[PDB]
Ligand binder design. Structure first.
Ligand SMILES: O=P(O)(O)C(O)(Cc1cccnc1)P(=O)(O)O
Ligand SMILES: O=P(O)(O)C(O)(Cc1cccnc1)P(=O)(O)O
Ligand SMILES: [Mg+2]
Ligand SMILES: [Mg+2]
Ligand SMILES: [Mg+2]
Ligand SMILES: [Mg+2]
Ligand SMILES: [Mg+2]
Ligand SMILES: [Mg+2]
Lengths: 334, 334
């Protein structure tokens, strides 16, 4: 299934590049931005649009063109992600992503990658218009993408407000605060977004149904960012494909929050003295305080308990949607 | 008229900030981003929406609420501009704007201002939904803002492709190329955008009419960027409110294009040896080559000839719109 999704990408780059004449060099650059930046991940968020589309729509309405609209809106979720990651990797001062150097760390790109990210966002709406203009769900999708863009930028704002360069923020790191950040920066666009899109494509616009689906899916995304945080420090970088910067970027990590509520006063000071600084030996002290506190073990328990809780929420809130929508998702993330 | 437009801004910040609870600090930050970044200019682009609204709509349909929608869509054109300038001042490595330091040069903002610009763009569509959701022109406006965002990002792309840091690009500087850049990066969102918005608000959706209005307005914006370029080097910075970076940023300026087509071979080499470098004495040599070539005089003639040409285009293409729409605009820019 991921094979057929990735092959559809060559067509979306054809249509996105078919505007060629005076703007020839800019189209080319956009091509190059698309290939470097949308390709290379797992495609879970975009495939999710398509998988749930097939589960929610009557197979007698799965026209070859309605299927193509589904492939395209899935790619739109991947361009959103790609827009946010490019910018995010500047702001976080990250080195690699998806096994290559962050695009803006490329000789000859640098801060021009701010335009480039902006262009990736613009492509969403060019795609929606080319494919979904005359569909009844056109405006609902535009509005969903825009709203999930806003929520994600609110989350980024808190993410950064909470993590100033060169400033001990330890007291700012609460669970309350952690949950607010990940709710907005991650849960909306990675989980609620692609399910909600498929739903509007299937003519399920009921407000209580999106709410119920959102109840489940926001908690899934909350787990997924907890996982992202854990793996920033403890993930095999030949697997994750990205070098981690949380500690040096002085971030409100699940890890630090959990550390802070188990640390002795002496341990608090090790963190105070060592967190949020670019010196490897400083980063190493924190990682070792985390390992001494048995945080990989705590993560593993939390992963078990969150899973049980998410499945209980599917029991409560999935109907009248097929549970398989939410269960295939949970399979993929846990 | 600019007084009543600027006073409406306090209400748009109220509504934009009325989402307050967990996201309290992010709303606050957004407030601060709005005030620093949307306030402080001349407001010509946003007022234009409102002025043309009053000229295009039947006064018996200028409800107090339809007038409020007009004020709000004008502010939406100013948030677009503000989104683009913030990012632009990073990418151009500018120092000041509107008489204060570029926002991202502010202690404690830096590259976080990438999120901030993104948030400013998102506010357009939050405003359109709060005020224009149930209007017949809702989707036409969303689509116009999005499309003018794309075109502007295509223009930025060429602007930068054409001006690499530390690389003699002289041969790349043509008129053909100059015109393509300013067409996209400036003409669409500063001139066609606000007139077209007012037009859709007045229920003038005719395709040939937008084309005709666009014929006039794209050339006005082409002049306006030529003016912007001239003033980057020759403008009183107590008036312009911004320090110029064109030469050091190795940019395809109207000035350089014009220089390059009048320079002697020896003069070409002065430019080759001196353009696109951060050394003040280097910048000074170029400025003096421009003054020796009598470019302020050439600009002044071009300003006269472009004006005559724009007014001839108004003769041809304004009908059935009131010429006053286009004439008030020309007054403001020349
Ligand atoms: O991929 P990354 O940088 O680990 C991340 O997940 C990317 C990201 C970007 C925007 C919203 N949410 C997550 P972050 O929170 O920055 O750690
Ligand atoms: O205000 P600036 O930087 O003079 C400018 O006009 C700003 C700008 C931003 C985006 C599109 N067009 C103009 P630029 O072309 O960068 O010189
Ligand atoms: Mg990041
Ligand atoms: Mg981040
Ligand atoms: Mg991370
Ligand atoms: Mg600039
Ligand atoms: Mg610029
Ligand atoms: Mg300029």
């Amino acid at each position: 299934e991921k094979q057929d999704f990735v092959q559809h990408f060559s067509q979306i780059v054809r249509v996105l590049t078919e505007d060629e004449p005076e703007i020839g060099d800019a189209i080319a650059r956009l091509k190059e931005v698309l290939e470097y930046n949308a390709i290379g991940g797992k495609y879970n968020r975009g495939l999710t649009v398509v998988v749930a589309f097939r589960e929610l729509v009557e197979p007698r309405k799965q026209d070859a063109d309605s299927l193509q609209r589904a492939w395209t809106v899935g790619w739109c979720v991947e361009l959103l992600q790609a827009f946010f990651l490019v910018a995010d990797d500047i702001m976080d001062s990250s080195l690699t992503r998806r096994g290559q150097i962050c695009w803006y760390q490329k000789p000859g790109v640098g801060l021009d990658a701010i335009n480039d990210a902006n262009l990736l966002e613009a492509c969403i709406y060019r795609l929606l218009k080319l494919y979904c203009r005359e569909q009844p769900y056109y405006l609902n999708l535009i509005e969903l993408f825009l709203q999930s863009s806003y929520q994600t930028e609110i989350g980024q704002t808190l993410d950064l407000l909470t993590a100033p360069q060169g400033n001990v923020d330890l007291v700012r790191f609460t669970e309350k605060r952690y949950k607010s950040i990940v709710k907005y920066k991650t849960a909306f666009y990675s989980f609620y977004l692609p399910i909600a899109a498929a739903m509007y494509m299937a003519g399920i616009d009921g407000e209580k149904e999106h709410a119920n689906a959102k109840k489940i899916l926001l908690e899934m995304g909350e787990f997924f960012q907890i996982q992202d945080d854990y793996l920033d420090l403890f993930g095999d970088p030949s697997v994750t494909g990205k070098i981690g910067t949380d500690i040096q970027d002085n971030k409100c990590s699940w890890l630090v929050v959990q550390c802070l509520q188990r640390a002795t006063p002496e341990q608090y000071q090790i963190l105070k003295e060592n967190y949020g600084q670019k010196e490897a030996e400083k980063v190493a002290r924190v990682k070792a305080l985390y390992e001494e506190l048995d945080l990989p073990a705590v993560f593993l328990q939390y992963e078990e308990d969150s899973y049980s809780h998410i499945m209980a929420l599917i029991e409560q809130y999935a109907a009248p949607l097929p549970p398989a929508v939410f269960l295939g998702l949970a399979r993929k993330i846990y």
